[PDB]
Amino acid sequence: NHVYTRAAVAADAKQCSKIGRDALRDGGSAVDAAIAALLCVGLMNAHSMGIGGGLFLTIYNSTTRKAEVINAREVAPRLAFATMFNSSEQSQKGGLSVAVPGEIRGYELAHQRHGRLPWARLFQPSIQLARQGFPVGKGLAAALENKRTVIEQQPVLCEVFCRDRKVLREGERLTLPQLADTYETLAIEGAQAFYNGSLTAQIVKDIQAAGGIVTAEDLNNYRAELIEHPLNISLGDAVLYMPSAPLSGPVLALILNILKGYNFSRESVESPEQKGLTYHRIVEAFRFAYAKRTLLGDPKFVDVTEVVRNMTSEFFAAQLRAQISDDTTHPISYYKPEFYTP
Amino acid sequence: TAHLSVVAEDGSAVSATSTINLYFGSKVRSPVSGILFNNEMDDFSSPSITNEFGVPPSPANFIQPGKQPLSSMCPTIMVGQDGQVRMVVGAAGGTQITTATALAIIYNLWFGYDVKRAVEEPRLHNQLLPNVTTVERNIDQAVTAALETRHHHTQIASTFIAVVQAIVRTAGGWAAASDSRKGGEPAGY
Ligand SMILES: *[C@@H]1O[C@H](CO)[C@@H](O)[C@H](O)[C@H]1NC(C)=O
Ligand SMILES: *[C@@H]1O[C@H](CO)[C@@H](O)[C@H](O)[C@H]1NC(C)=O
Ligand SMILES: *[C@@H]1O[C@H](CO)[C@@H](O)[C@H](O)[C@H]1NC(C)=O
Ligand SMILES: *[C@@H]1O[C@H](CO)[C@@H](O)[C@H](O)[C@H]1NC(C)=O
Ligand SMILES: *[C@@H]1O[C@H](CO)[C@@H](O)[C@H](O)[C@H]1NC(C)=O
Ligand SMILES: *[C@@H]1O[C@H](CO)[C@@H](O)[C@H](O)[C@H]1NC(C)=O
Ligand SMILES: [Cl-]
Ligand SMILES: [Cl-]
Ligand code: NA
């Protein structure tokens, strides 16, 4: 049941939750624990996230009572352009599909602002895990099976993800010895090693060799961004902090604002008559909220100010709730999906 | 995609969601560094690529140099009027992230389900286009019937809908839950 009197980490792999917890016990901040745990998930779920990707953190300081967001999502390289892909396969595989990784700049910014433990300490348990290896978990095993063909026919992937030329199965040992060395370099040399240091030329070489266009200048210029005022909504006596565009906080805000007007409670699910109507109303709120999603984009490049103002407005939400019919769903056009600002 | 939730002894908290996008990202692994590179460029819309029958590309989310692609991620922290964290929650699952994060919040805050039940409770999803409601395998079939009599077309998810990690403050301290759909477990003290 995992109730804890002092502190808690909930990650998607048991060993990574324990690594986060150990950081907390050793005097780390919530940010130290999150970074140490994320470094571990990057190994245990290497198919899902890692230092080749990007992340967002929502952080709340109990003392100042302030929340902030750190934006370390990947960005299109300087040589990218709107018509660079003509098929889904071009946009999904190979070096041209790679955006500039932001993960390590994100960890650095968060740790500069909120760290208590030394940077190298955050990497130590993951360097050990990558060298000694670990049993393949359920999620990774499923992904390996789903991608077996691709994996098995690519020697650089089969190097770590196969055993005797076949993909690893759940319970079999995976070791990540090159990543262990990379994590050690990052721990010793800092985030600079990735973006403007000893790893940078090799990153560019690997991406370009696979047909990509990321350059050293792209890595040098990458910056994580501090957002001092995250999106928020009021729910009852609480405030919900979440990222705005380019993430989906505005969609979540609109869903909850539409639904808060129904005053759901445990009675809403106490009988099938009530429970059925309640779930209908939830699905309709999703449909209204997703109609508005296609206007969203990076707010540095697209003007989303009005869209986001509507999506976070309780009054706009009440106008949409008034259009939810208790007896029927409606065709797509009813929800007014929009691809251009009206 | 991975979602992690943390609450420290001083009451500070982090909700973090991270991704390389599709399974094994671009499928480009460095033979020297071992880094597996993302395929996040696939999260942009492109004028020449149609992903769903009758759905046009979204120009707001076209590629530009230096631009970030739209994301479904939503790492959230709910804080009470007294300044103490109430809930730390987020999800993995592509476009299902936003609906599953909504459900976990609804389930705990309004229906009164404890955190583990809020995470384990069956979910459903609709994103307007496509025009179908996906429900998980073990959803209350009275819900399925209530949706279908109201003219929703439902289909059962072949695996599951999203993965949620969450921590909620209780009288007992911090109650944590990792989603069994992925097989995580929390840790704490
Ligand atoms: C897609 O087509 C445009 C116009 O011909 C071209 O500039 C671009 O390089 C093409 N992309 C690929 C990956 O073939
Ligand atoms: C929270 O804010 C207080 C007051 O400014 C500060 O002393 C402390 O370092 C902060 N905690 C973290 C983890 O940033
Ligand atoms: C480091 O930064 C400067 C300018 O950003 C550049 O001249 C140099 O090539 C960089 N080094 C690496 C390894 O990227
Ligand atoms: C919620 O949203 C905005 C920040 O732009 C502001 O009006 C208000 O101070 C915020 N509320 C809280 C509790 O941070
Ligand atoms: C915002 O909502 C109002 C109605 O409440 C509407 O007039 C307007 O078109 C909306 N603006 C945008 C950019 O969607
Ligand atoms: C979508 O499903 C609804 C629900 O039955 C139906 O009214 C509508 O015709 C369907 N098609 C479109 C294009 O909205
Ligand atoms: Cl490796
Ligand atoms: Cl996850
Ligand atoms: Na639990």
Author numbering:
A (entry chain A): 35 to 376
B (entry chain B): 381 to 569
Sentences from the paper on this structure:
γ-glutamyl transpeptidase (GGT1, aka γ-glutamyl transferase) is a cell surface enzyme that cleaves extracellular glutathione (GSH), GSH S-conjugates, and other γ-glutamyl compounds. We previously reported the crystal structure of hGGT1. hGGT1 is translated as a single polypeptide chain, which folds and autocleaves into two subunits with Thr-381 as the N-terminus of the small subunit. The side-chain oxygen of Thr-381 is the nucleophile in hGGT1-catalyzed reactions. Briefly, an oxyanion hole (Gly-473 and Gly-474) facilitates the attack of the side-chain oxygen of Thr-381 on C5 (carboxyl carbon) of the substrate’s γ-glutamyl group.
The GSH analog ACPB inhibits hGGT1 activity by forming a covalent bond with the enzyme, thereby inactivating it. hGGT1 was incubated overnight with a 60-fold molar excess of ACPB prior to crystallization, although even after just 1 h of incubation, no hGGT1 activity was detected in the mixture. The structure of the ACPB-bound hGGT1 crystals showed that ACPB was covalently bound to the enzyme, and the phenoxy group on the phosphate of ACPB was no longer present. The data show that the phosphorous atom of ACPB formed a covalent bond with side-chain oxygen of Thr-381, the catalytic nucleophile for hGGT1-catalyzed reactions. This covalent bond with phosphorous is analogous to the covalent acyl bond that forms transiently between the C5 carbon of γ-glutamyl substrates and side-chain oxygen of Thr-381 during cleavage of the γ-glutamyl bond. The second oxygen atom of the PO3 group (O3 with a double bond to P) interacts via hydrogen bonds with the main-chain nitrogen atoms of Gly-473 and Gly-474 (2.78 Å and 2.64 Å, respectively). The binding of ACPB locks the active site into a conformation that corresponds to the hGGT1 enzyme–substrate tetrahedral intermediate. Refinement of our data showed that both LαSp-ACPB and DαSp-ACPB were bound in the hGGT1 crystals. In the final model with Rwork and Rfree of 15.3 and 18.9, respectively, the inhibitor was modeled as 70% in the Lα isoform and 30% in the Dα isoform. A comparison of the position of Lys-562 side chain in the apo-hGGT vs ACPB-bound hGGT1 shows the side chain repositioned inward toward the carboxy end of the inhibitor. When compared with the apo-hGGT1 structure, the structure of ACPB-bound hGGT1 has a larger active site cavity, shifts in the polypeptide backbone of the enzyme, and a major shift in the side chain of Lys-562.
